[PDB]
Amino acid sequence: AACTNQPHIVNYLTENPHKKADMRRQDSRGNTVLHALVAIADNTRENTKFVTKMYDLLLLKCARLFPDSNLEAVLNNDGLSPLMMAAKTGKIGIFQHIIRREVTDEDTRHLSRKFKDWAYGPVYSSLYDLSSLDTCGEEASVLEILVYNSKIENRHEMLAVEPINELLRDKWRKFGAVSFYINVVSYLCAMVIFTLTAYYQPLEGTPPYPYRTTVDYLRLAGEVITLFTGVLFFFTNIKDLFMKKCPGVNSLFIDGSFQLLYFIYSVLVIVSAALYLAGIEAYLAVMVFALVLGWMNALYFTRGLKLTGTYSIMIQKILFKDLFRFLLVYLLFMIGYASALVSLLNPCDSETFSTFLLDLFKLTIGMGDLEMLSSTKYPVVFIILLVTYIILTFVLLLNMLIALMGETVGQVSKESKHIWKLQWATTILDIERSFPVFLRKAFRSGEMVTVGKSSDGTPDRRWCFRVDEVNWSHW
Amino acid sequence: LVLGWMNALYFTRGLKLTGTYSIMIQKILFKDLFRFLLVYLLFMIGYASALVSLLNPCDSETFSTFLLDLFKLTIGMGDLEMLSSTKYPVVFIILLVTYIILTFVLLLNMLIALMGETVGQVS
Amino acid sequence: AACTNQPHIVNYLTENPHKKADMRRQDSRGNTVLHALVAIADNTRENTKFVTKMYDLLLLKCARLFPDSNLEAVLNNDGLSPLMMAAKTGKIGIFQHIIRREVTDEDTRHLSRKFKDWAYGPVYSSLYDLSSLDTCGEEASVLEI
Ligand SMILES: CC(C)C[C@H](NC(=O)c1cc2ccccc2s1)C(=O)N1CCN(C(=O)[C@H](CO)NS(=O)(=O)c2ccc(Cl)cc2Cl)CC1
Ligand SMILES: CC(C)CCC[C@@H](C)[C@H]1CC[C@H]2[C@@H]3CC=C4C[C@@H](OC(=O)CCC(=O)O)CC[C@]4(C)[C@H]3CC[C@]12C
Ligand SMILES: CC(C)CCC[C@@H](C)[C@H]1CC[C@H]2[C@@H]3CC=C4C[C@@H](OC(=O)CCC(=O)O)CC[C@]4(C)[C@H]3CC[C@]12C
C-alpha cells in the first residue's frame, strides 16, 4: 500500500480495531517498509515527492506509536539501513532528503537530522548530524559505501551535498595533508634506495655473496629494507582486502588498478629473494622488472594533487580501454603482414624468422634500413606490401587512435573538477582507514552538542557537525 | 644571447594577429608541459635506472655514455647495439619496447589532448 | 544598518534630536560606510539593487548635509577609495554603477560622473568624467589596479 501511494489505506491498516500491521516488520529479505519504499524510489520528479511524503508520514507514525525505538535503526539481512541502501543504490532523491531531515513538531523533533545553530544577519549557521554518516570503524559508513562501491548511477551528484564536502575538507585539513607528504617522502626514499641497490649489484660471483668489506654494511641494508618493504606492502594489501569484507574482482581489476599493482610488486620483490638464495643466476631478470614496476606505479601518490590529479586517472583509463581496443586491430594487421612477408622470402628457420621480425619491428619504429628485398624473389610485390603496411598503420591508424584518445581526454576535461574531487576523497579516506582504531577515535570530528532531550527528559548528546552559509533574500 | 633572443615575445604580445600566441605558449609551457613532465620523468628515471643496472660490463663514464645513447634513441634516431654486450637480452628488448610504446604512443601525443583543450580555451 | 538593508533605521540614526552618526566616520581599518557597503556588495541580482540604492541614498544625504566635502574623497588606511576598492575586489555590480553615476537633482548634480553633451537624431554624445579613473602618476588609477 505504501509503495502504491495510497495514504488512506496505510492509515486505516496501521490503526484498525480488528488487526494492526506493525511498521517494524521484516520480510524474508529483511527489508522493512522503509527499505521497500527506498527500493521502488526513483529519481523522477513526481516519484520522489510522494516517496518522501510517504516516508516521512510512516516514520512519524512509527515514532509516535513507539517512542522508545527508532524505525530507521532496523537493518536488513545485508546489514544495511535505508540511508545506506539508498546511498548504495544511487537514489539521490530520497538520500538528500534523509540527510537534511528536519522536524518542526516539538513532540518528535528528536529524530531530526538537521538543526539550526544561529543566524547573524545574512549569515546562517546550521548544525547537521552525522551519527551514522561517518564511522571510525565501529560500523559501515555512508561515505565509504558511496566512494568505494562501483556502478553507482549518481555517485558524483550524491558526493556534492552540504555536509559531505565540509566533512571531507575538515578531515583533509586536520591530518590528511600532514601524512600525505610523509607518505610521498618515505616511498620516494625507499625507491631511491632500491635503485641504488639494483645499480651496485655484483655480477661476478655466484649469489649469495660474502659480506666482509665496508661497502657491504651499506649494500646489505638496501636489500634488507627493500625486502621488508615488499613484505609490508603484501601484508597491508591483504589486510586491506579483508578490511573491506573481501571485495570481488570488480573492485580490484576494473578500477583502483594501483591496489592490484602493488600486489604484483609485492610478489616479484620476494620471489627474487628465493632465487637469490638458490636461483642465483637469474634473480636480476625479475628484480629489475620489479624495480621498473615500482617506479612506474607511483602515480597513486600523484592522484591526490589537484594540479596533476586527473592525469593519472585518465592515463590509466585510456591505456586499458582505448589503446587495447586499437591494439586488437593493430595486431591483426601485424600478424597478417608479418606472416605474409616471412612466407614470401626465399632463403636459398626459427632464427631467420626471429631476425626478420626484429628487423621489421626496427622498421616499424621508423629507423633501420630496407635491405631484405635483395635476397627475396618478387621484390616489387614485397615493396608494394610494405608500402601498404606503412601507409595503413602509420598514416591512418597511428594518429586516428589519437582522435578518440583526444575525445576521451575531452570527456575528462569536461568532468575534470568532478573526478578530482572523487580521487581526492578516495585517497584521504584510504589514508584514514589504515590508522589504528584507537587513534581514529582520538581524531573524531564534530561536537557533542545536547541539542534536545529525550521523551523522558534525558539528554541525547549525539555527535554533530556545524556549517554555515549566506543568504540575502531572507527578509 | 639565447635567452635574449627567446624572450622577444613580449613585443609580439601587442600585435593582434599574434597576440594570443605568446600568452598561450607561456601558459601551456609552465603548467601543462611540466605537469606531464613529472610523470615522464618518473618513467625516465625508472627505465634508465633499470637498464643501467641490468647491463654487465664484463662506472660513471659508462653510465653517462649509456644515458647519451638512450637519449639519442629517445629522439627517434641512433642504433640499438647495447643488447649485444648485456646478458638476458630478451628481457632488455621487452623493457625497451614497453618504454617506447608507453612514452611515444600514449604519452607523447596524449599530452596533445589537454594541450589542444588549453588552446581551445584560449580560442 | 546600511549593510542590512534598513533604510528607515539609517534615516532615523543619521538625523536624531539626541545623537547623530556622521557618515564620514572611519573604523580601525579606515573603511567608512561606503567602504563597508562595497565590501559586502555581491554580484547577485538582488544584492546589487539594494547596494546601489543605499549607496546613492547615503551619498546624497552626506552631500546635502555637508556641501563642502565629498564623501567619496575619504580614503582608508590602504589608501584606496570605494571606486578603487570595488575595482580591486572585482565587484562589477557597484563599479559600473559608480562609473556612470548621473544625478538629475539640480541642487546636488555636481557630484555626477556622467553628463550629456548633445543629441543629433539617433546619435547621442555623452561626456563621462575620469578625474580619478586615469592618473598621470599623481595618484593610483583605477585602470592600473
Ligand atoms: C603509515 C600512515 C601514516 C600512512 C599510510 N602509509 C603506510 O602505511 C606506509 C607508507 C610506506 C612508504 C614506504 C615504505 C613503507 C611504507 S608503509 C598510508 O597513508 N597508506 C598505506 C595504506 N594504503 C594502501 O594500502 C592502498 C589503499 O588500500 N593500497 S595500495 O595501492 O596497494 C598501497 C599504496 C601505497 C602504499 Cl605506501 C602501500 C600500499 Cl599497499 C593507503 C595509504
Ligand atoms: C607493436 C607492439 C605493441 C606489438 C609487438 C610486441 C613486441 C613486444 C614484439 C614485437 C617484435 C618482438 C621481437 C621479435 C624478435 C626477437 C628476438 C628474440 O631473440 C633473438 O634475438 C633471436 C635469435 C636466436 O634465438 O637465435 C627475442 C625477442 C625479440 C626481441 C621479440 C620480442 C618482442 C617483440 C619486440
Ligand atoms: C626528456 C628530457 C626533457 C629530460 C632529460 C634531460 C636532458 C637534458 C638530459 C637527458 C640525457 C642527458 C645527457 C646524458 C649524458 C651526457 C654526457 C655528459 O658528458 C659526457 O659526454 C660523458 C663522458 C665523460 O664524462 O667521460 C654531459 C651531459 C650529457 C650530454 C647529459 C646532459 C643532459 C641530458 C641530454
Author numbering:
A (entry chain A): 292 to 639, 662 to 788
B (entry chain D): 582 to 639, 662 to 726
C (entry chain D): 292 to 436
Please quote the authors directly.
TRPV4 is a polymodal, calcium-permeable cation channel that has emerged as a potential therapeutic target in multiple conditions. TRPV4, expressed in the plasma membrane of a wide range of cell types, is a polymodal ion channel whose gating is controlled by multiple endogenous lipids, and exogenous stimuli including synthetic ligands, cell swelling, shear stress, moderate heat, and ultraviolet light. Human TRPV4 adopts a two-layered homotetrameric architecture where RhoA attaches to the bottom layer. RhoA appears to act as an auxiliary subunit, interacting with the ARD through three loops connecting AR2-AR3, AR3-AR4, AR4-AR5, and with the membrane bilayer through the prenylated C-terminal tail.
Three additional complex structures were determined in the presence of distinct ligands: the antagonist GSK2798745-bound TRPV4-RhoA complex in the closed state, the agonist GSK1016790A-bound TRPV4-RhoA in the open state, and the agonist 4α-phorbol 12,13-didecanoate-bound TRPV4-RhoA in the putative open state (ligands are abbreviated as GSK279, GSK101, and 4α–PDD, respectively). We observe that going from the GSK279-bound closed state to the GSK101-bound open state, the S2-S3 linker (M534-S548) undergoes a loop-to-helix transition, thereby altering the interaction network among the VSLD, TRP domain, and CD. In contrast, the rearrangement of the S2-S3 linker in the open state couples the VSLD to the TRP domain and the CD. First, the D531-Q550-D546-R594 interactions within the VSLD are broken. As a result, Q550 (S3) interacts with both the hydroxyl group of GSK101 and N528 (S2), while R594 (S4b) forms a new salt-bridge interaction with D743 (TRP domain), and D531 (S2) interacts with R746 (TRP domain) (right), resulting in the ~3 Å swing of the TRP domain and rearrangement of the CD (HTHCD). We resolved GDP within the RhoA-TRPV4 signaling complex in the GSK279-bound closed state, and by including GTPγS before freezing grids we observed density consistent with GTPγS in the open state. We did not, however, observe substantial structural differences of RhoA between the GDP- and GTPγS-bound forms in complex with the closed and open states of TRPV4, respectively. Despite only subtle conformational changes in RhoA, the buried surface area between RhoA and TRPV4 in the open state is reduced (~684 Å2) compared to that observed in the closed state structure (~752 Å2), suggesting RhoA-TRPV4 interactions become weaker in the open state. Notably, the EM density for RhoA progressively decreases from the closed to the open states. Because we include GSK101 before freezing, this data suggests that either bound RhoA becomes more flexible, or its occupancy decreases during GSK101-dependent TRPV4 activation.
